[PDB]
Write an enzyme that holds these catalytic residues in place. Structure first.
Site, short mmCIF file in Angstrom:
data_model
loop_
_atom_site.label_atom_id
_atom_site.label_comp_id
_atom_site.label_asym_id
_atom_site.label_seq_id
_atom_site.Cartn_x
_atom_site.Cartn_y
_atom_site.Cartn_z
N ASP A 23 -0.33 -7.51 1.81
CA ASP A 23 0.17 -6.14 1.73
C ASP A 23 1.70 -6.18 1.77
O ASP A 23 2.32 -5.76 2.74
CB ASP A 23 -0.39 -5.31 2.90
N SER A 29 4.32 2.16 8.14
CA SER A 29 3.98 1.09 7.21
C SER A 29 5.21 0.75 6.39
O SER A 29 5.98 1.64 6.03
CB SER A 29 2.80 1.47 6.30
N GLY A 30 5.41 -0.54 6.10
CA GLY A 30 6.53 -0.97 5.30
C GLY A 30 7.74 -1.37 6.13
O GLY A 30 8.63 -2.05 5.63
N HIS A 88 0.83 -1.21 0.00
CA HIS A 88 0.00 0.00 0.00
C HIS A 88 0.86 1.26 0.00
O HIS A 88 0.40 2.33 -0.37
CB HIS A 88 -1.04 0.02 1.14
#
Ligand SMILES: *[C@@H]1O[C@H](CO[C@@H]2O[C@@H](C)[C@@H](O)[C@@H](O)[C@@H]2O)[C@@H](O[C@@H]2O[C@H](CO)[C@@H](O)[C@H](O)[C@H]2NC(C)=O)[C@H](O)[C@H]1NC(C)=O
Ligand code: NAG
Length: 218
Positions: free
Chosen positions: A88, A173-174, A41
């Site tokens: 994801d 995120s990530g 994402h």
């Protein structure tokens, strides 16, 4: 990261900052000299040609000679569901190979299918929001968290800081989740806002993607 602490400089040399216009927006993990992995994402609604992959960073506010900067050459996704945030995960080949050194090292990954049971102790990290209205962190943050299966689903690794309000947040995120020195998660999403103390944080389950990763990064 809400409620964590500064990482020691270059404690986690696999830690990567994905940047746009010279600014951090997502974490990633170096998994080969010319590949990183992040959350799908993170690269969904952005000009990937403009994304910079920053290795060897610690303080986003500083100019750091330890840094090596690459661009995205190739993109791999396997069934990423943008509505339910399933799978994801993205693998991003870089336009060159990192120089491996003290501050820039590849991460170690688990065996395919390896499952961490409820209750295991890990470490989350990232440059994301320090809290509501506190902005992203200058200095890489880290946080002791606990793997949990309560309020989770099979398609995620979930974590919770038991007993206080702390967790990952926007901009994290990530980023890698490290358990026993191995990368078992990639930060994907929170529920009830960050550090709700009600819902655990959700990570893409790296161990479910190891065969696929193996097939790409070699
Ligand atoms: C908070 O976590 C740190 C680090 O956690 C370990 O290393 C992470 C990268 C990850 O691999 C985790 O699963 C590991 O548990 C803990 O520091 C460790 O503490 C142990 C016991 O004292 C010690 O033997 C190790 O040297 C430490 N590891 C490192 C990398 O420094 C710390 O104990 C945790 N604190 C609490 C109270 O949970
Ligand atoms: C990769 O891209 C970066 C950033 O645009 C650039 O500085 C560098 O020349 C490229 N590296 C290689 C090895 O081509």
């Amino acid at each position: 990261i809400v409620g964590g602490r500064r990482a020691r400089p270059h404690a986690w040399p696999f830690m990567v900052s994905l940047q746009l216009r010279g600014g951090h927006f997502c974490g990633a993990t170096l998994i080969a000299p010319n590949f990183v992995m992040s959350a799908a994402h993170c690269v969904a609604n952005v000009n990937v040609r403009a994304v910079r992959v920053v290795l060897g960073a610690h303080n986003l506010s500083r100019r750091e000679p330890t840094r090596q900067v690459f661009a995205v050459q190739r993109i791999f996704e396997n069934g990423y569901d943008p509505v339910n945030l399933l799978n994801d995960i993205v693998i991003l080949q870089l336009n060159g190979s990192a120089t491996i050194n003290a501050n820039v090292q590849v991460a170690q990954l688990p065996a395919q299918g390896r499952r961490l049971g409820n209750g295991v102790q890990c470490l989350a990290m990232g440059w994301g929001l320090l809290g509501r209205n506190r902005g992203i962190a200058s200095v890489l943050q880290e946080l002791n968290v606990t793997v949990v299966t309560s309020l989770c689903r099979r398609s995620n690794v979930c974590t919770l800081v038991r007993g206080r309000q702390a967790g990952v947040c926007f901009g994290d995120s990530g980023s890698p989740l490290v358990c026993n020195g191995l990368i078992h998660g990639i930060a994907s999403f929170v529920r009830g806002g960050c550090a709700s103390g009600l819902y655990p944080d959700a990570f893409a389950p790296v161990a479910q993607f190891v065969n696929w990763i193996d097939s790409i990064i070699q």
